[PDB]
Write an enzyme that holds these catalytic residues in place. Structure first.
Site, PDB file in Angstrom:
ATOM      1  N   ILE A  71       0.882  -1.135   0.000  1.00  0.00           N
ATOM      2  CA  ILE A  71       0.000   0.000   0.000  1.00  0.00           C
ATOM      3  C   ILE A  71       0.918   1.181   0.000  1.00  0.00           C
ATOM      4  CG2 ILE A  71      -1.529   1.320   1.461  1.00  0.00           C
ATOM      5  CD1 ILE A  71      -2.465  -1.555   2.449  1.00  0.00           C
ATOM      6  N   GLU A 160      -1.957  -9.120   2.439  1.00  0.00           N
ATOM      7  CA  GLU A 160      -1.566 -10.426   2.978  1.00  0.00           C
ATOM      8  C   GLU A 160      -2.556 -11.556   2.663  1.00  0.00           C
ATOM      9  OE1 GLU A 160       1.195 -10.580   3.587  1.00  0.00           O
ATOM     10  OE2 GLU A 160       2.059  -9.120   4.994  1.00  0.00           O
ATOM     11  N   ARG A 163      -1.846 -12.599  -0.991  1.00  0.00           N
ATOM     12  CA  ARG A 163      -0.608 -13.369  -1.085  1.00  0.00           C
ATOM     13  C   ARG A 163      -0.697 -14.789  -0.550  1.00  0.00           C
ATOM     14  NH1 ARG A 163       2.565  -8.439   1.697  1.00  0.00           N
ATOM     15  NH2 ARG A 163       2.884  -7.152  -0.181  1.00  0.00           N
TER      16      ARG A 163
END
Ligand code: NAG
EC number: 3.2.2.22
Length: 246
Positions: A71, A160, A163
């Site tokens: 970000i 996260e 991912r």
């Protein structure tokens, strides 16, 4: 780009958002079947904009570097906020240009710096959809200490999750109740770079890692990932940081 509405959000629609997000990140190759993120990109094409609506329908738009899923800043109403980072700064040259004013947060965006600014490690910050809804609200109205904490929640419930499948799942379990993240989740979040790298290196080493990646499993046990047959590679990790960025 990718939108997510917390009003009426259930595990199903969150899963739809995380998928849209993964699908919005460009890649040309796949390594052991996991999309490989590009070495770099140029222009406004290097950034993805996510629309996040809190329960009440108020919105922020978040900018993600599509080559590493970081970000870099966000927009809240007519105000844009970016991290105290060269990369973050560079990013401000392409998004939220129409922002009335632009604020730069005192701190950089790595999880470690944000943890200080927040006054607490993320092992103590409850995450989940309710927490995401709160995070959104906190960023609408500036406070930088509050914001540091809300960004750690936002990063974990978006970047996260994208991912790692296990993390998207953890968040789905916390759809109606926040819980701090498991150690496993923390371990994973911290091992993305190394895993991305060791997975890429195994292409010329018969699927075996030059160096083994140490994690903790869903119960406090330290384990070593030595090769691509492990579930973290076969089932879990969904995106790879291009080694040209490690
Ligand atoms: C490869 O991974 C499997 C499963 O994680 C493990 O049991 C095995 O010992 C590893 N093999 C080698 C040669 O490292």
């Amino acid at each position: 780009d990718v939108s997510f509405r917390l009003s009426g959000a259930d595990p199903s629609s969150y899963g739809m958002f995380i998928k849209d997000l993964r699908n919005a990140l460009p890649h040309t190759e796949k390594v052991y079947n996991i999309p490989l993120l590009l070495p770099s990109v140029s222009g406004a094409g290097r950034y993805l904009l996510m629309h996040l609506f809190n329960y009440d329908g108020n919105t922020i738009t978040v900018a993600v570097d599509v080559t590493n899923v970081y970000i870099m800043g966000y927009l809240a109403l007519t105000t844009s906020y970016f991290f105290n980072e060269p990369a973050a700064d560079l990013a401000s040259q392409y998004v939220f240009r129409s922002a009335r004013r632009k604020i730069t947060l005192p701190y950089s965006g790595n999880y470690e710096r944000l943890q200080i600014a927040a006054g607490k490690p993320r092992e103590k910050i409850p995450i989940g959809l309710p927490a995401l809804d709160t995070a959104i609200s906190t960023l609408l109205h500036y406070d930088s200490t509050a914001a540091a904490g809300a960004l750690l929640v936002l990063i974990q419930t978006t970047a996260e999750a994208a991912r790692f499948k296990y993390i998207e799942q953890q968040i789905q379990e916390r759809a109606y109740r926040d819980e701090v993240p498991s150690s496993a989740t923390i371990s994973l979040e911290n091992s993305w770079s190394g895993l991305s790298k060791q997975i890429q290196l195994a292409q010329g080493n018969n699927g075996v890692f030059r160096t083994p990646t140490v994690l903790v499993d869903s119960k406090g046990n330290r384990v070593q990932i030595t090769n691509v047959t492990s579930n973290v590679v076969t089932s879990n990790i969904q995106l790879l940081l291009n080694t040209k960025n490690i």
